[PDB]
Design a protein around this ligand. Structure first.
Ligand SMILES: CCCCC/C=C/C/C=C\CCCCCCCC(=O)O[C@H](COC(=O)CCCCCCCCCCCCCCC)COP(=O)([O-])OCC[N+](C)(C)C
Ligand SMILES: CCCCC/C=C/C/C=C\CCCCCCCC(=O)O[C@H](COC(=O)CCCCCCCCCCCCCCC)COP(=O)([O-])OCC[N+](C)(C)C
Ligand SMILES: CCCCC/C=C/C/C=C\CCCCCCCC(=O)O[C@H](COC(=O)CCCCCCCCCCCCCCC)COP(=O)([O-])OCC[N+](C)(C)C
Ligand SMILES: CCCCC/C=C/C/C=C\CCCCCCCC(=O)O[C@H](COC(=O)CCCCCCCCCCCCCCC)COP(=O)([O-])OCC[N+](C)(C)C
Ligand SMILES: CCCCC/C=C/C/C=C\CCCCCCCC(=O)O[C@H](COC(=O)CCCCCCCCCCCCCCC)COP(=O)([O-])OCC[N+](C)(C)C
Ligand SMILES: CCCCC/C=C/C/C=C\CCCCCCCC(=O)O[C@H](COC(=O)CCCCCCCCCCCCCCC)COP(=O)([O-])OCC[N+](C)(C)C
Ligand SMILES: CCCCC/C=C/C/C=C\CCCCCCCC(=O)O[C@H](COC(=O)CCCCCCCCCCCCCCC)COP(=O)([O-])OCC[N+](C)(C)C
Ligand SMILES: CCCCC/C=C/C/C=C\CCCCCCCC(=O)O[C@H](COC(=O)CCCCCCCCCCCCCCC)COP(=O)([O-])OCC[N+](C)(C)C
Ligand SMILES: CCCCC/C=C/C/C=C\CCCCCCCC(=O)O[C@H](COC(=O)CCCCCCCCCCCCCCC)COP(=O)([O-])OCC[N+](C)(C)C
Ligand SMILES: CCCCC/C=C/C/C=C\CCCCCCCC(=O)O[C@H](COC(=O)CCCCCCCCCCCCCCC)COP(=O)([O-])OCC[N+](C)(C)C
Ligand SMILES: CCCCC/C=C/C/C=C\CCCCCCCC(=O)O[C@H](COC(=O)CCCCCCCCCCCCCCC)COP(=O)([O-])OCC[N+](C)(C)C
Ligand SMILES: CCCCC/C=C/C/C=C\CCCCCCCC(=O)O[C@H](COC(=O)CCCCCCCCCCCCCCC)COP(=O)([O-])OCC[N+](C)(C)C
Lengths: 70, 70, 70, 70, 70, 70, 70, 70, 70, 70, 70, 70, 70, 70, 70, 70, 70, 70, 70, 70
């Protein structure tokens, strides 16, 4: 029948971390610039968004390190 | 006839904690990065997801310790 | 003819609390880790599942204490 | 007379996991987008529907692994 | 008799993603503007609704990528 | 019988973005002036309400641009 | 049955910008004089309250200019 | 059906960084001049708003540098 | 026998939107004043109740516009 | 004898989607306004009722599209 | 049998806006004085409570103006 | 023999809406006060119980209006 | 046989509003003091409990006023 | 049964504005003297507390003037 | 059988306002001292806890005054 | 033959409200303490269980008061 | 046959309040320390868990006091 | 079973005001010295921490004086 | 069958307070250092986390002291 | 199955305090230099960030000292 479940979860990871994910990064950075004007600028806001991109992209390396193999 | 029920429940554990489970870990980590941007960053959110992977993977060791044998 | 009913109910208890039951414990723990990610983490969920294993395994001791003999 | 029952149950599996099943997948994904707007967005809702497609499609591989042969 | 079930599920997908779906998108965007006034403005609310339209429209591409064929 | 669903959703959009919507805009602006007195004046409050009117009115153009056609 | 919703929202605007609104203006000005004594006098406080009256009264003209018609 | 999700997120980026974004820049600069009068002038306020425009515009270059490709 | 069902549903609409409905409006407004004291005052609470009266009264006009005739 | 069953089911459809159905629409809208006051206002409640009228009225067009002929 | 529902809702309005309501007003004013001491004094707190009494008492006039008759 | 069925159903209505019904009203109101303490206070709970008394008492007037005669 | 139902419902009202009800009032007040310490103090909490006692005790007067007789 | 709700709310007002309220006034004044030493002395702090006593005591006169009768 | 419910609710009041309640008072005061250090000191925090003890202890007198008898 | 049915129902009441019932009370109280930890603490949970013991024990007095004799 | 039901309910109470209950207390305290880190520290959380142990252990004394004998 | 709740709350008070509390006092004083350097020195900071120790230690005397007995 | 429930709850306590718990302590301390940079430094944050480790580790001593034996 | 939970928490500590942590230190120091210009320079800001690095790095030594072993 259909492909094994191991392949499908790989397709989601490839799609998320592909061209779609890269265009999500620029949208998050834009929200920082829009928020600093018409509001208040702080180090906590910029650190949170940039930290999110670091965790999101390259999450495969984080998963391998935490699990210990793969 | 079919194999004994003790073997079948072992197959589920091997499948869950195999390559399928490892690709589930990276999807959970990705959701952390996506959530920190376009939202709010907190220590509770990251601790819950990372704690979930610790409980999920290596649950055999937790079961043996709690039961006391095996 | 067949064995007395007292022996048969002992066989069910031995089978449930044998290797089959131990592999059921690790499946319950896995469901905790899967649920904490892709969702919400709470103390009620972990307490209920761990409390279930405590009641399930060693139910013979609970039955003897409640009845008062055996 | 008619074909053996082993063949008929194969026809149902082929029909479900054929073009009919693929068009069911896109309807489930559409319900996610419709639900996020005019309502609330959560990780539990998207995880449940996507997890359903993973279980539904490729269920033959899950059945073979659980049974242990085929 | 009637048409095969594969055709009917295609008609639902075409109707949902046709002119009816496009007019649903503008209603979701209107609810964002109405909610920001007479209330509170946040990045989470706008991200959820816009993310919903992305998932809803073009769900056929998401289904093909996840399944792996079609 | 009744008109097709494509027409009904158009009637809601016309009614919302008609004379009713224009009188909603002046009510949102009034709430800014009432809030600045008997309280605190900030750039975040005025930006949120004015941004809401921009998103609400002309949401058809935003929907067409995001979808890519219509 | 009842009057159309377009008429009701007009009644709120007329009531707010009528005699009730004019007596709200004098209360806001009084709070400036009370605050300057028993406290500190600054240009920011007076500018915010007077700016609020300018936005509140005549909000119909601001709405027409922003929307572009009416 | 509809276009792939990779195209839609590109349309948002083009719209934000297009003529709409440029007119947002002049509104942020105007708020600096309005704030310096009827208030206090400081280097922190001007630096925050100008820094916001730098982050907002050209966020694609920042995303490419951080990710490392594209 | 009895009157046709078309007449009965008209009687309910006339009764609801008659003197009984008008006295329901003043009770809803009273709950706003009682809630602002002994609690917290917000724009969301007042907007929801006033919006409810607008939808409730004059619902015949909303029904005619949505349906497209009558 | 009596008329053919094809005619009777047409009479039910005409009666439901006639003047009786139109007066049912205004009763559903009234319940929205009554519910927003003396309670909580949400986008899910209004979307469900308005979506119901869209499905109910013009169900003939939905049936023709799904079936594929008529 | 009992009196018509139009009379009962009038009795609630008379009771609320009678001697019971007047003694509720003095309790709300007392909470302002108690809160200013043992705490912080602000214009927002006093404006909210006094605004609540204005909305609560005389809600009949507000209902008549909004509805447009009675 | 016995009295006609029209008389018996009148006796039930008189008994329910007599002294027995009035003492039922005070029991329903008491449950509101008991529930607000040792729990949570909300407008939905009080509105439901008070609305129930309005429907219960004076149901004869509601029946006459709906039927259209009597 | 037994007493009429009108007498029994009077006995419940007398018992609830007797010495038993008065001792319930002091328990509700105690919960306010216990909650303010080891937690947060707010005007909403005290108003809800005190309002509950007002509704509970003297509910006979509220029932008579609403019904209009007795 | 119990006394009417109009009497109970009078008892709260008498208790608050009785000997209990007078001893609350001296505690508020003491906090001014304690705060001026071991800290900073300002006209805003003393004005707020003394203004609170003026609003708290004699709130009945303020309520009568605002309402317009009683 | 058992004692009347009037006696049981008296036992709870005696137990709460007995030696157990007095030792609860000292625990609440301790939390004030622990909170002032390792944090911030304010008049609102101390007033809330001390006010809680006043309401908790001697709640019988408050209940008698509010009810009007006992 | 056997004893009259009036005696048997007395034996059940004596047994339930005897030593067996008293040991049931302590089990209900234990469930409160177990539930507050590993979960959430609320006033509704404790009030329900304690209210249950009040109704259960001393139900003879409640039955006599309601019936009016015995 | 078996022992009387009065003895069995005593065995449950002894088992719960024995060594098993004492080890449950330390698990509840551990959850406080784990929750304060990787999250937020508050007085409500610690008070609820410690209050639970007080109610759980020594529930026999609470049952005797409430019942009035034993 | 376990000890009465009056004893347990005494154990907490003894533990807090024992050797553990004395070592908490020196940690609070250390934070004053660390804060004066690498920062600003003020009389408000030292007064708050020293006042906290006075309230914390000897809280039993404060509780006895406030309650009036023990 | 399985071991008694008293042994299992001991295994959880040993595992939590073993090498796993010690490595949890260093993760909590790391979060303090990460939070002070890219944000704000305060005494409340460090006190809460360090206080959590004190409660978590050595919870057996706290349980013994509170219970009074073991 | 997977590795024991003791190993996974070690991997997180090694990763955080590895090359990733060292590059986090230089980013925190950069924020000090950027903040001193375009703003105000103070000893509190530099002390907080440098103190954060001291706590973050070498947190294993702090954990061992506090716990007392390992
Ligand atoms: C599986 C391996 C995963 C590895 C994850 C590695 C993370 C290291 C990353 C990045 C550096 C920058 C990113 C965050 C910076 C936050 C600054 C900030 O400021 O936010 C902090 C949040 O504190 C953090 O989150 C810092 C914690 C970083 C990770 C903690 C240690 C590693 C994970 C251990 C947790 C549980 C272990 C599992 C147990 C079995 C709050 O401050 P705020 O004012 O912004 O609050 C915003 C609230 N409003 C909007 C209302 C103002
Ligand atoms: C069979 C052996 C099983 C062993 C399990 C071992 C677990 C130790 C693990 C990990 C460290 C990090 C993982 C969780 C961190 C939570 C932080 C947080 O923050 O979440 C806490 C939850 O509190 C916890 O869960 C911490 C408890 C950890 C385990 C408790 C003791 C061991 C189990 C005893 C229970 C019953 C015993 C059986 C009785 C017979 C809530 O805070 P929140 O703001 O996130 O709420 C989120 C809610 N929103 C989204 C609305 C904001
Ligand atoms: C489908 C196409 C849709 C296009 C939408 C275009 C929007 C651009 C518009 C406008 C300029 C002004 C309007 C908002 C200004 C906010 C200033 C402020 O201050 O609010 C900010 C909120 O941050 C924003 O929302 C700015 C974000 C603007 C849009 C973000 C990028 C575009 C959308 C991407 C999101 C997801 C993409 C989809 C992923 C597949 C918070 O600050 P606050 O202090 O007011 O917090 C108030 C809280 N209290 C009341 C407690 C203090
Ligand atoms: C709706 C119509 C309202 C009409 C209001 C008319 C006002 C004219 C009045 C009075 C003459 C004396 C009263 C103030 C004298 C201040 C002297 C002083 O010295 O204070 C000045 C404050 O500057 C002023 O406020 C003067 C401005 C007067 C009004 C400005 C123009 C009219 C309003 C335009 C604002 C926005 C327009 C709306 C935009 C749409 C600061 O100096 P300082 O050393 O005392 O700072 C004290 C700080 N420590 C304590 C730390 C040392
Ligand atoms: C049916 C006819 C009804 C007519 C109602 C007329 C109202 C005019 C009244 C009064 C003047 C003073 C009373 C409120 C003053 C607020 C000041 C304040 O400060 O509160 C503002 C709230 O903003 C307001 O509510 C002002 C809005 C006034 C009415 C708005 C326009 C009329 C209604 C349109 C809404 C929807 C229309 C229907 C659509 C179909 C927030 O500031 P905060 O710092 O206190 O936040 C407190 C939060 N903490 C405690 C955490 C700090
Ligand atoms: C058949 C024709 C029907 C026409 C209906 C027309 C409605 C326009 C009306 C009014 C202006 C003011 C009334 C609501 C203001 C809400 C402000 C607020 O604040 O509430 C918003 C709710 O968002 C809204 O509902 C705004 C949406 C307005 C209508 C949306 C577009 C039209 C209908 C499309 C839906 C589906 C289409 C059918 C698909 C086939 C939430 O914010 P919250 O903080 O109050 O949450 C309260 C929660 N707590 C209590 C916990 C804090
Ligand atoms: C129903 C009838 C009610 C009648 C109420 C009558 C009030 C007149 C009373 C008193 C004279 C002294 C008492 C307050 C003095 C404040 C000085 C101060 O300094 O505080 C001012 C607050 O501004 C005021 O509140 C003055 C306003 C006085 C009343 C306003 C006009 C009457 C009410 C209209 C409001 C809405 C109308 C209803 C709309 C339908 C702030 O300055 P701050 O530095 O202390 O800020 C402290 C903040 N930290 C601690 C961080 C530094
Ligand atoms: C048959 C005659 C019955 C007469 C009943 C008379 C009642 C007047 C009484 C009392 C003054 C104080 C008592 C409540 C104060 C609430 C303050 C508060 O704060 O609670 C408000 C609730 O809003 C109210 O309930 C005020 C409404 C008062 C009555 C409304 C008008 C009369 C009844 C009309 C309803 C339907 C009519 C029938 C239609 C046919 C919510 O705010 P919260 O933050 O506490 O939410 C707590 C939620 N957490 C815990 C999560 C934070
Ligand atoms: C049950 C019996 C309890 C007895 C309690 C006895 C207390 C007397 C004690 C001590 C002398 C020194 C300790 C505090 C010194 C504060 C100096 C300071 O400066 O702090 C004051 C705070 O004002 C106080 O708290 C002084 C009040 C002292 C007690 C008040 C009267 C007794 C209690 C009555 C309250 C309610 C009664 C119950 C009603 C039924 C604020 O100034 P700040 O610049 O530090 O603000 C810091 C804010 N930042 C960090 C942003 C700069
Ligand atoms: C049969 C005899 C039984 C005797 C029971 C004796 C109890 C006294 C005990 C202890 C002191 C500390 C323990 C609880 C402290 C709560 C603090 C807190 O904070 O929790 C309060 C809960 O309010 C309480 O439960 C205090 C009530 C204490 C007992 C009430 C009076 C006695 C019983 C009368 C009830 C019915 C009588 C029967 C009628 C016939 C809520 O606040 P939260 O922010 O934590 O909400 C948490 C919600 N989240 C997680 C979302 C933030
Ligand atoms: C488990 C073992 C852990 C050991 C931790 C050891 C820490 C010693 C370290 C370092 C020297 C420099 C680092 C901080 C310097 C702060 C200077 C500053 O200025 O900040 C101080 C903060 O006061 C501190 O935090 C100093 C306290 C240092 C530790 C306290 C004693 C040890 C821990 C005891 C706490 C609880 C014990 C557990 C109870 C069971 C505030 O002043 P600010 O103007 O910057 O406020 C900034 C606010 N704005 C941005 C608005 C202006
Ligand atoms: C990780 C290694 C980091 C190494 C950092 C090395 C720094 C040495 C650098 C530079 C020489 C010139 C740069 C600053 C000159 C300030 C002159 C001035 O005047 O400003 C001083 C500020 O006092 C300083 O900041 C001097 C301190 C320099 C460093 C302190 C010792 C090293 C770090 C120890 C701190 C905590 C240790 C960690 C604990 C575990 C204030 O005076 P102001 O009138 O300008 O106030 C301006 C206010 N208005 C605008 C209102 C007038």
């Amino acid at each position: 029948g259909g492909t094994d479940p191991a392949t499908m979860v790989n397709n989601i990871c490839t799609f998320i971390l592909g061209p779609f994910g890269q265009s999500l990064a620029v949208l998050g950075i834009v929200a920082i610039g829009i928020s600093w004007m018409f509001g208040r600028a702080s180090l906590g806001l910029v650190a949170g968004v940039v930290g999110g991109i670091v965790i999101m992209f390259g999450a495969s390396f984080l998963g391998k390190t935490l699990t210990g193999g793969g």
